[PDB]
Design a protein around this nucleic acid. Structure first.
Lengths: 122, 49, 195, 49
DNA sequence: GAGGGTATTCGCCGCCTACCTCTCCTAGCCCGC
DNA sequence: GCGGGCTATGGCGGCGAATACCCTC
RNA sequence: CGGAGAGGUA
């Protein structure tokens, strides 16, 4: 089962998946600058991965099928990290970013079931 | 702000001054001032005075 | 609308005509409506009252078991301390390393005790919430609400957003509230009467 | 028409997110945005910016 | 602490009528041909 | 490479209610 | 002819 396999794979890796809010099509640029700031600002100990869950919708527009890289959850960024103000800086101070999508008040981490559901190729 | 942003999302040894500078904000603020300001007033030309 | 939505006229316009109706502070509505806090739409009473004593016994057993596990951890830490003392007295290590390792060990013991107290206070907080859970109560700190629902999924129901206030209005009789306010007005008196 | 478009956009967004399934956090955030959009439509500027 | 009595602060509402003239009413960017 | 569509702190008074500070049980 | 701003007349 790919679901169980990815569950086991993500069980061991450090960092709890979190969610961040972006501005519409300004998402891939957001992840670009985010992991680039991981490379540069020396915050590689926090952001272990950045994912824009996106299945490309091949739809029949303009008389032909065309893929649309819609971000399954548009405007949202799934980023694996820890409780660090540095990762908050590197994401929420990055371009095309609005803030961390907390549950009640502070940022909350997606349950591993949901992140496995949305990180699995559709 | 744009140049500082682009200063971290482009590889070194390919950056040049002309590829980091976007004039748009400046040429836009100048027009904003000279078209849509309370001080850039349509001149009164009733008589020379 | 895909989800219920409040009408801002009866929420934000001073006086908040939703706060007075539901007896909620405007900040409470600001939080519940804008997804900054959970609210107890209702709490079962008979399913609470009947099982109160049984759940008290269950919580006593739970606290005793957790305390026993913590005491076992402290016993393991004491075994580590004994091993440290044996190492110190085996070879020659003067007061520098002796104090270093002893301070390390006592710091570990204090950490274990802090964990103990924090867990005990978490359970005490859970029970205080359970013995005080009534409708129109905001449960901030999603982790606390998650613990409450996971340990006690039944005995209450909490929602969050506009639908929670819709539920509160549905489970809200107008005659009893009017009678209570009339009683507070005619009898009693004071700032209570003004409000 | 602009505000109506905002509300319709957010309603369709939240509809798709529920239909396709999503974590409760994301759906709650989208419901918050829909609430703010409707509040702006009825009375813009009363709450927040 | 709860409670009450006083203050204290902030949000909102209101601010004559009628008329003439003029200039601007997006910008950035991402996808498509 | 160019065109088109989609998205993103110099007011001032009155007033009330949503809230600081202090004595009492 | 809808909005914003500026100037002006009584």
């Amino acid at each position: 089962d790919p679901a169980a396999a990815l569950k086991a794979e993500l069980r061991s890796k450090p960092g709890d998946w979190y969610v961040v809010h972006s501005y519409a099509g300004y998402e891939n640029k957001v992840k670009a600058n985010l992991e680039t700031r991981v490379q540069n600002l020396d915050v590689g100990d926090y952001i272990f991965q950045v994912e824009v869950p996106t299945e490309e919708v091949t739809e029949i527009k303009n008389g032909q099928r065309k893929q649309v890289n819609r971000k399954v959850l548009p405007g949202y960024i799934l980023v694996r990290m820890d409780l660090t103000d540095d990762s908050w800086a590197a994401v929420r101070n990055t371009p095309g970013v609005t803030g961390f999508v907390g549950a009640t008040s502070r940022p909350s981490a997606l349950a591993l079931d949901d992140v496995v559901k949305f990180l699995l190729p559709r | 702000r744009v140049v500082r942003e682009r200063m971290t999302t482009q590889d070194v040894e390919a950056i040049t001054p002309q590829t980091l500078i976007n004039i748009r904000p400046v040429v836009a603020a100048i027009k904003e001032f000279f078209g849509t300001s309370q001080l850039s007033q349509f001149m009164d030309q009733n008589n020379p005075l | 609308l895909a989800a219920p939505v409040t009408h801002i006229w009866y929420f934000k316009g001073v006086p908040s005509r939703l706060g007075y109706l539901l007896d909620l502070a405007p900040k409470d509505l600001e939080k519940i409506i804008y997804f900054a806090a959970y609210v107890i739409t209702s709490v079962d009473e008979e399913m609470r009252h009947n099982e109160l004593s049984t759940l008290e016994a269950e919580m006593a057993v739970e606290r005793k078991a957790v305390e026993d596990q913590r005491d076992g951890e402290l016993e393991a830490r004491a075994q580590k301390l004994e091993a440290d003392l044996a190492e110190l007295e085996a070879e020659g290590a003067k007061a520098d390393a002796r104090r270093k390792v002893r301070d390390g060990g006592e710091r570990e013991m204090r950490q274990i005790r802090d964990r103990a107290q924090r867990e005990l206070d978490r359970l005490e907080d859970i029970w205080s919430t359970f013995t005080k859970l009534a409708p129109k109560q905001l449960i901030v700190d999603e982790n606390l609400y998650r613990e409450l629902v996971d340990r006690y999924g039944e005995y209450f129901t909490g929602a969050m957003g506009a639908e929670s206030i819709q539920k509160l209005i549905e489970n809200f009789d107008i005659d009893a509230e009017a009678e209570s306010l009339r009683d507070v007005i005619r009898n009693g008196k004071g700032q209570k009467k003004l409000r | 028409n602009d505000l109506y478009r905002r509300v319709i956009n957010r309603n369709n967004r939240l509809k798709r997110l529920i239909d396709l399934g999503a974590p409760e956090i994301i759906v709650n955030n989208e419901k918050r945005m829909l609430q703010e959009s409707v509040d702006a439509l009825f009375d813009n500027g009363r709450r927040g910016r």
